[PDB]
Design a protein around this nucleic acid. Structure first.
Lengths: 54, 75
RNA sequence: UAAGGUGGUUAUUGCGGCGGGGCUCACCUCUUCCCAUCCCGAACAGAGAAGUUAAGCCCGCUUGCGCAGAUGGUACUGCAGUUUUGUGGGAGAGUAUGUCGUCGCCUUUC
RNA sequence: CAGUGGGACGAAAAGACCCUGUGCACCUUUACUAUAGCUUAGUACUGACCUUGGAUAAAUGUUUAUCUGAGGCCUAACCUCGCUGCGGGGGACAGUGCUUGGUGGGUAGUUUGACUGGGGUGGUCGCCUCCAAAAGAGUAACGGAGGCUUCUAAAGGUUCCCUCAGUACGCUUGGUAACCGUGCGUAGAGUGCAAUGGCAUAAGGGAGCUUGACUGAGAGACAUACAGGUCGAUCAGGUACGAAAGUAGAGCAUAGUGAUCCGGUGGUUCCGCAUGGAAGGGCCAUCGCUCAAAGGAUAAAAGGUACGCCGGGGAUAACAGGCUGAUCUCCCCCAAGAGUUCAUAUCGACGGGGGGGUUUGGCACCUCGAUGUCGGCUCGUCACAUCCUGGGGCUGGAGAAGGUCCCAAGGG
RNA sequence: AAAAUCGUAAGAUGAAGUAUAGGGCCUGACACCUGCCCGGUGCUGGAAGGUUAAGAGGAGAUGUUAUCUUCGGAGAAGCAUUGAAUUGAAGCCCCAGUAAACGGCGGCCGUAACUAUAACGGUCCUAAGGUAGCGAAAUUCCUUGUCGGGUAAGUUCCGACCUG
RNA sequence: AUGGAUAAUAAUCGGGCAUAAGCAUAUUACCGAAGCUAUGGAUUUGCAAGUUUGCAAGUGGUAGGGGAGCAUUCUAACAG
RNA sequence: GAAAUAGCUCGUACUCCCCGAAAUGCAUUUAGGUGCAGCGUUAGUUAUAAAGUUAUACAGAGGUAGAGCUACUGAUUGGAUGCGGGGGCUUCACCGCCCACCAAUUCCUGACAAACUCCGAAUGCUGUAUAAUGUUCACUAACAGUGAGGGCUUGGGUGCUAAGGUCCAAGUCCGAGAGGGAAAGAACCCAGACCAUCAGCUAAGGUCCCCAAAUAUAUGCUAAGUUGAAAGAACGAGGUUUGUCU
RNA sequence: GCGUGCCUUUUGCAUAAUGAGCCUACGAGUUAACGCUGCUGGCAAGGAUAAGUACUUCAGUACGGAUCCGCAGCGAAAGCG
RNA sequence: UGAACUGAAACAUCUAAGUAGGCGGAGGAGAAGAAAACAAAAGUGAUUCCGUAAGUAGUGGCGAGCGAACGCGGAUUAGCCC
């Protein structure tokens, strides 16, 4: 049930800045469904941004 | 039979003793659970390992209902 | 001298029982406000000073429960030879016994 | 000198029985990978016309010029027969070449693990906890006990708080084992999951807010054949909680795992074969292996040999020898009884102490460049733990026949 | 122009034969007979339905750029890579047959006058639960089974029983 | 000290044999090895003199490692 | 082809001098082979040198031997209570009773444990300084062999507190080792072989002869040839010497 | 008086584990290419030539700098140094 | 036309190896030989052989292993016919 999720930054890919911020975490496909969203530090933009599960 | 399995030893025990010198990051005691508690200039890690904080001389000084409190006298 | 606050000391410092005390400590009266109960001003928080040592707290006594604990002997054991032993180390348990703490720094007091 | 053959583990054959070698050979199949042959379709040799269907192009549901799927017919390629080029039988079929799917031990190349108180059978192969382990660390057995191939978006972070299990006394259901009230209760609870250690001034439980389960990194140490593994303090950029100090780079800590190659996904003017792109590759993040025989020899793999062969082993078994008695046989010690009464004329349970090495075993110490194995025949020889003959004691011995014990190996 | 056999082929045997003939396989004179099972593996026939090769076919996508776009980017034609719909046989799945084709052919419980047994009844599972015949056997471990004969004495032998 | 059975080719303090030549304690002398020492000699390292000597420590040895050399056949020079 | 391959057996030729091991650990289609580590040789480095070895003084952590359990977990001998349940009589009423066993909790004693600990040594380990010995220590380079071990003493597991059995740990020896003693024995006791000598002193063990040295001294025991090599039982006995009580 | 041949394999052999009837002759770590260590030699921030060519009394001095190693490293790479 | 033993410490891709072997033809030599070639912003100009480049680029169950080319220095030098 425990799957591997990839939280990619959401405010990224909208500005003229090359790159993409991602976080490779684990989750449960039964206990926590519906595309978990978590605030993580974006190393490209140098600020905390909400990353949503792909 | 059904008894032929065992695991490798973790090489626990007591590192630098209570009369020897240590430095800023020397492991003092490796334990499974805090049976040697940290004192002055000595902290504990995630695995209940005792680390030194500054250079000095180790001192155990068991006290308070037979509980070892490892500390470091700076020098 | 007495009390309050705050620390060091592995309960010989603790638990219990019996008497004494209150400028400070504590109960004690209320919930408008600050604050809170998965229900309750019980606890926490605030506003006061009618009463009280009754209790908490502090003193004096108590071997009662706990805690500490010898000297001597014994077990065990390093080295040397051996059926024996000689040289050193030396417990645990138990007995006699001890303990109703001790050491600092601040404020009000005499 | 003539006769018999007990020994020289006598001579002969680098044991043919057993084990072994990532040795060989042959054979088998529902092991792997191929192939001869057989067979299906497409295509070339292979052509002319009618019927029936589909598609494209044009014009106003049909028509006209093509492609294709099928049938029928014709002879003119191609095949066959009879007379010596004809007269018949088929016919664009069959045969053949290339490309393909299925069968195919008919054939060929190979694989088929190790540990092991001989080898098979059974069991195990990686990781974690306790004992063995002899008070630093480490330390083996097919030694004694158990678990793992995970889980939590909260079972993570911070701030503020709370105290367990059990038991006694009371109370409708309710029963002293449900909830409640008052005492006693240093830990006997709980800490997801085995064990050990730890934890109440909590690592156990609750509430509020949150995502540090961040980015760039690693002073110094512990383990250490290597590959790997474990802990960790300062600094910078932005965060969560908290009034602030301060804490937070995942869980109370030890198990929850798989190297390399190859391939996939996201980011990246890093390179990109004359130049500019691209294919592709490189760097960072990450995915795919019960490779479980878990340091994984291939992407891909099972058996028989008494028809066997070669190279070695007493490193290792079967006969015999050797050490020890578990088993075997014999004796002795105590005596509850049985013997009409009376333990020991005779037997003797429940227990104990030894002698012998004749049985079945344990070990694997000499022999696998050979120590010929059961039974019977001939020839004997030795011990006495005596079957007869010989000499005695006791008797539940009237005599004769008995029972038991002692001495005795000359002959049978 | 047989099947089949040898060969790369041509060719040859079969056969200067032709179903009362020629191959493949089992059993083994003669007498009586030769039971049940098509589940599994082989063989034959069918082909409505599913899957399925090469070869045809080319919706769309990608690379390059004439040109247009202040930048970004879009991009006709040509040239190349990659290609999905559609068509596509045998075989396999499927349907039925075949055992003188390979192969297979069961248990428990209760019950009749003294005992014993069960003609009989209940129940579970199969494709079927082994018929006739024989039976201590070239097949039987217990075993030197049990009874009779042979011998003074018979682990061998003969004739019986049936717990094969 | 004594009784508590013994194994098969002829046996055992090693044998003769011993009443101590057995056992227990104490003492003295002696024997006893390639151990130690006395004499002679050779060799390896380290230290000095020189161009061999002196002193100190050594000198069992398998697998294995290092250093100095002998003989054999032939070749180049000088001398036979 | 071809001198196929052989992780296998066998063989491997002159001399002298110096040094000198291992039979262990981790992996392995691996176990009688290898790779790395451990142990060896040669050469070079640390100098106002460093490191080693033994002992002493000081200072540390431990949970073995031992001990104890009313200090937990499990087991456990004997007495005191017996709350309450099972069984006999009395009866309308497992109703009010009367009687003997298994019997909760508590107290007192006796005592067990590798996977029990309220306790807990000796030794061993680590660090500093000192005192003895001086490269024995450590580092680099090159080259190897070994990776079948075994006996004895001690602490253990398994086995039958059996094995010249087997698997570990702390030492020594053989392996690779001559000489002397036990009569002869790879390991037992003494002792580490540069040669030569018709020299002396000793170790273990012995002094009647074989066979070197005491028929030596003092005291007592044994009558069994016990014994003079090693090694024995439960259980008997009016053998003898000797101490105490009686 | 003392003294159980030799070799090989072995924890361990007089071993009754292997091998040899004896003598004479033959018989087993050699060479090439490419490297690494120890000693020695030339040159020295430089060192060395290969194939080849010329002369000559000819299987035996001069020339030949192509090229190789070292002098600067880090990074996958652009690149920096 | 064309193997296998062997190596990969097994083995099938691979190596061994286009080797051994078999068949046919020619000459003192044979083959090749005059660019539908290299190279890269600078250039060379037929083929053959020797030394470097170089154990480099690359290839490979990316395992065992296999392994060029460009450029440079030399021997020789020659171009023509449908």
């Amino acid at each position: 049930n425990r799957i591997q999720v990839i939280l990619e930054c959401t405010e990224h890919k909208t500005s003229g800045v090359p790159g993409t911020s991602r976080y490779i975490t684990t989750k449960n496909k039964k206990n926590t469904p519906d595309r978990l969203e978590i605030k993580k530090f974006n190393p490209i933009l140098k600020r905390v941004t909400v990353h949503k599960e792909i | 039979s059904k008894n032929g399995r065992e695991s490798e030893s973790k090489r626990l025990g007591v590192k630098i003793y209570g009369g020897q010198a240590a430095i800023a990051g020397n492991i003092i005691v490796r334990q499974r659970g805090s049976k040697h508690n940290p004192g002055e200039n000595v902290y504990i890690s995630k695995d209940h390992t005792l680390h030194a904080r500054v250079a000095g001389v180790v001192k155990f000084q068991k006290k308070r209902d037979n509980k070892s409190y490892v500390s470091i006298i700076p020098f």
